[PDB]
């Protein structure tokens, strides 16, 4: 690819995390440009996206600074449409197994995710709800890896989908952050050190050691800070 | 392709439709299963549907074969279909395309699908779903379809929009019959003009005819749901 590439998201966004990560796995030559969660998004934000949706790509166009977005560029929201639009731009970098039955489980492992996994990432971190359907759907998930390795084998989409969460997670976990009570919370750090849900540890450890993650992670401690101001 | 192909579904299910049209467009040889019987957790063991087996041996539906991998999730079905059928540009062709209509099926996935089902099988207030209905068809262009031409965006929405339009002109759904009204009326106003040609182009469409059993069908089908009154 020869055109230029930049990713809006906000600051520290789970959802933008994952079109970073493929831009990274990708190869890309992109520009990213963060914005401030808390500040009110600037007004010419509107140029990239006139609702304010985020995370966004703009794509083509003349090279421009990021708070100078062209009219002329394509822009691009949702963030799975972003994974699977890298993947497109960058057919070499197999972001995507090759055979279309390897690539139908890596979009049917995100679908797990979505479907059973994510909202209860919500439930329970941020709204308080009984965190046993977290830990079930979790659970869930990790029955679909394979005993090792990512969920199709070879790093794919499906990370870049699911890692920003993942790691969110445990990193929350870890910290005694979310909205759930002490018990519930005492609760799920003890399954997840606990032999049911070492596939899932696993999972998230080889996620963390991979370079495009880490890249677009930054480190715990900013996203510890930037957890705690939520 | 020469791998089989064999779709299963439940008889009037929507997510099978929408693998069922998609396997329509790209000229696909492929059996169809409609149907819990035991010999389906040989399909597959958590009892999911739809589902596609791929390759394998020739069998009949009802006798999967080990061999053939399997297959669920109706989205992941659709993208599948367009990947062992890249030349019928399921999808067009560029990425920037490609990715408004994957953008066009989160907008019903995200907003609109979950509406759908709180105003038509859970009688709640119908005022949200509106706005969805709304808010995916001001991502529609004026003329056509999703991206221009047919897409996997079609073969996605289509098999609930389709039913939308079936059960509020049929007077079907738990909505009171105040948010009937309502729901009739708007879809009847220039509001909501785009979305309704958008249906209407979409049952034109040959897949779709096939697939639908047409408006006779689906109306026994529908007045056999309980989850409708
Ligand atoms: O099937 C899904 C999907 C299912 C449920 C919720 C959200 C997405 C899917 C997810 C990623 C992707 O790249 C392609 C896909 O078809
Ligand atoms: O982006 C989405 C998506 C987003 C939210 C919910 C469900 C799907 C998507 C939808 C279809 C598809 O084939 C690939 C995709 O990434
Ligand atoms: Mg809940």
Redo the contacts with the bound molecule.
Sequence with gaps: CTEQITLYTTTFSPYGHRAHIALEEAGAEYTLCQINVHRDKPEWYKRVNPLGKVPAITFGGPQVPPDEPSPESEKLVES??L??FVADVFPEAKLLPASPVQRAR???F??IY??YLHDQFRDAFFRGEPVGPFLQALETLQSALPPAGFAVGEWS?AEA?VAPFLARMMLYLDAGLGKYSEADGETMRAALASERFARISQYVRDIRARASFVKSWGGDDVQLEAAKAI
């Design positions: 799975l449409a994974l699977e890596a979009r049917a995100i679908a979505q479907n989409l989908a």
